[PDB]
Structure 1
């Protein structure tokens, strides 16, 4: 009964929206946070635990999966969902960002050649090959393959990368639409580029809306610009995107970045922060992050957060988790990660509820006042 892709906005407050994305493998509540499942695992969590925290969708990294265990191998093993045991929607990034940030790079208009950061094996990516890999994975939301430009970006380099990206967005569209099984069961998002420059962002938006996509991502942020500049860029960039389609801010971010981005019209988020910070001993709380290794928690019997409903905060103390993290114990990573992901989902839930009730502006004020009292 479920549709391929249907975004519906149930309530709005200013630029903020709340609603649902209906897909064949499930419903995504927006604004949505996607836990990151890099190499076919949300690190230190079983998929059932990921779901129990409230996640409706997770993200997979195309660049990592193509290096290990391999895209064709995953297809032969019945696709990513079956492989890793997550049966709800999966969004896959294009891999273009990690090629720039992780691999040993030839770049051209056809695509990119690079050496694996793991073993120096040679690989290739292009609009067509990236769409094909995401198809071999079985991805539900496919990202167009673009060209990332490092930070900071000179206007010429930002416009160079943006224009080639828009040509690649058209090739991504066509590659997606050529493959019937993919085009009937998955969705395709386009990526706005153009750095901090308003004119380039607008040309990017026009090109993408001319091609037509199921959703639109804001690319090229959370790469060093700081929150003030990111918000300033969001202020004029998001209204350029089609209003009736989801808006996806890639790689963001800290809780306060998420709230501010929702205030500016963003519907979807992903970040390694809750998982990676958790393994490193940082727990998010409504009173700000805490460093659980600090000596002040060594005999603290309170849970990580006094209001959190997650199973970790129901069962174990700060003192216990302090001990596990300082001891290097795997269970420390597990509990910290589950709490952090549950905290992110509770944030998204409070965001959605406050928009639905027309008190999101008050929620954002209240959130910041307490989170930054620390």
Structure 2
């Protein structure tokens, strides 16, 4: 286990993760600048200074070059490039698509990668171009899978296992399934380079989602060749964790300027819509007249800053739970992105499994597409049985009509549209009705039985808070999202009321004592869990005999808790002891 990966935060199917490779730690989503050993526009040392803790280079180019090859063997890639972060390596696979062939065996490049001290290696996977004859895509893929088995047996370092089914969805699923069962640490998605350059984003969405549906959720995903900011938000929303970019340098060399919305030619620029170290001091009409080498240098730096800024923008949106809003915003950059964005939203089944049950940010109605965001379809389908039983519906700016009993709950109350939605406060007779509808909504059918005879306390405001019954608190309605925070006594009631495995997270015998003490539950000790659990749901921590150990909040979906071997599964509120 040289590679560890755990989720720290999430929104949509994307996530902020902690990746550790043999002692070197980085936070994802991250982007790795591609560096040309033969001609470095920006020094690896400067890239590291700028905050890029992971870079990538072509091991084949180094291998085929005497001076490079020799220096690499003499000092190791780190000292040769004078870089101390994570150094990933490409197997010149781009020359395998560009030139159809490569002069080196699978075993040889892998061995060379070990000799120069690479942090993350690769093997000779074949990047089948888009729309290739199916026969080709199949043949190349089998060769890729065969080379993958050899690499698995020979590798002594963490390695990428690229998914390569060309534009055939069934092949992507096949490749993804086979590689997931093998032991590699990262799964890049290949063959998308030509699609991105062609702005065929919708084809990229189908290849990425088809790949993610068949991949183990616990391994980092790398969109190979995706080095332009315009796709960051969309890609991260689908679960992509890593990006690589040679475009920052190549665009700079062709006098091209990156923006989060696309690309501009220096000659078409009258102003720099940027405030980075370059754009905050220079002007387009100045740069245009400077020496080639200086112009290339400054454009490359600018490109790197925009890249860095978009990633930080995506991560901050995830933290506040507004990634979908950013994606919607970015989709307006180009018709082809808009098309891809709409296609992505069609994959509701996939996205729904990872969409947090609650978010810090309010639901924003800012387009026709936002009405198709996962949280909206989930809320609509869930509120149905509730509206039917409790009636007393009220007009809603987004959902049309929702029972007044769910009018204080996310995303009904915590949403905003063109017109304001009026919160419907409880009566001292209604109070318990709110808690019951919420329980039904949040915990599912029959869950209201756990709170039937409870007493609901109302604050200074007519807002429901503490839910108590003949003794102590069973739960509390959160001020921020109108959902229930379970108390231990409340977890006991839901445990007897709902049939195993509902809301359950079953842990090892080893972890059982810790849970009883209120300590958090780590995914490695989770042997089983309810498939319906979603990130941030209230959950019942239990042992194999289904004996209550504690109650807490999930950080992963039920299914994820089973697969993940690192990171926390549940943030425990209280243990039975």
Instruction: Give the alignment's TM-score, normalised by structure 2.
Output: 0.54
**1:101 pairs with one of 98, 101, 104:** 98
Q: 1:12-91 counterparts in 2 under 5 A?
A: 12-24=10-22, 26-39=24-37, 43-69=40-66, 72-91=69-88
Give distance in 1, aligned partners of 2:228 and 2:44. 23
Contact 1:25–1:88 under 8 Å retained in 2: no
Give distance in 2, aligned partners of 1:56 and 1:142. 16
Q: 1:139-158 counterparts in 2 under 5 A?
A: 139-158=118-137
Deviations 1:152-187 (A, max 9, x none): 3111110111111111101011121xxxxxx2xx31
Q: Which runs of 5 or more structure 2 residues have no equivalent in the other structure?
A: 336-577
Cα 1:70–1:174 change in 2 (3 A) is farther
- Per the TM alignment, residue 229 of structure 1 is displaced from its structure 2 partner at its CA by 1.1
Give distance in 2, aligned partners of 1:371 and 1:25. 41
Contact 1:72–1:136 under 8 Å retained in 2: no
Deviations 1:40-65 (A, max 9, x none): 66x32122321233312111112211
**Residue 180 (structure 1) aligns with:** none
Give distance in 1, aligned partners of 2:154 and 2:106. 7
**2:252 pairs with one of 275, 278, 282:** 278
Give distance in 2, aligned partners of 1:34 and 1:230. 20
Give distance in 1, aligned partners of 2:68 and 2:178. 30
Give distance in 2, aligned partners of 1:60 and 1:286. 25
Instruction: Please say if 1:344 is aligned against 2:312.
Output: no
**2:148 pairs with one of 159, 169, 183:** 169
**2:117 pairs with one of 138, 147, 150:** 138
Instruction: Please say if 1:204 is aligned against 2:175.
Output: yes
Secondary structure of the residue aligned to 1:12 is strand
Secondary structure of the residue aligned to 1:148 is coil
Q: Which shows bigger deviation, 79-88 or 231-240? A: 231-240
**Residue 179 (structure 1) aligns with:** none
Contact 2:131–2:167 under 8 Å retained in 1: no
**1:240 pairs with one of 214, 218, 223:** 214
- Per the TM alignment, residue 288 of structure 1 is displaced from its structure 2 partner at its CA by 4.0
Cα 1:315–1:145 change in 2 (3 A) is same
Number of paired residues?
333
Q: Which shows bigger deviation, 228-237 or 251-260? A: 251-260
Cα 1:238–1:45 change in 2 (3 A) is same
CA RMSD across the alignment: 2.4
Q: Which runs of 5 or more structure 1 residues have no equivalent in the other structure?
A: 106-113, 115-123, 177-182
Instruction: Please say if 1:227 is aligned against 2:201.
Output: yes
**Residue 305 (structure 1) aligns with:** 273
Secondary structure of the residue aligned to 2:27 is strand
Secondary structure of the residue aligned to 1:223 is helix
Give distance in 2, aligned partners of 1:255 and 1:65. 28
Give distance in 2, aligned partners of 1:40 and 1:59. 14
Contact 1:252–1:271 under 8 Å retained in 2: yes
**Residue 265 (structure 1) aligns with:** 239
Q: Which has the higher contact order (CA 8 A, sep 6+)?
A: 1
Give distance in 1, aligned partners of 2:321 and 2:128. 39
Cα 1:28–1:291 change in 2 (3 A) is same
Cα 1:173–1:79 change in 2 (3 A) is same
Contact 1:189–1:217 under 8 Å retained in 2: yes
Give distance in 1, aligned partners of 2:169 and 2:333. 34
Instruction: Please say if 1:357 is aligned against 2:320.
Output: yes
Cα 1:198–1:100 change in 2 (3 A) is closer
Deviations 1:323-355 (A, max 9, x none): 12xxx5211111110110111011111111211
- Per the TM alignment, residue 201 of structure 1 is displaced from its structure 2 partner at its CA by 1.4
Give the number of the structure whose alpha-carbon radius of gyration is greater.
2
* Higher helix content, 1 or 2: 1
Contact 1:209–1:241 under 8 Å retained in 2: yes
Instruction: Give the alignment's TM-score, normalised by structure 1.
Output: 0.82
**Residue 119 (structure 1) aligns with:** none
Instruction: Please say if 1:253 is aligned against 2:221.
Output: no
Deviations 1:276-298 (A, max 9, x none): 1112111123454322123x53x
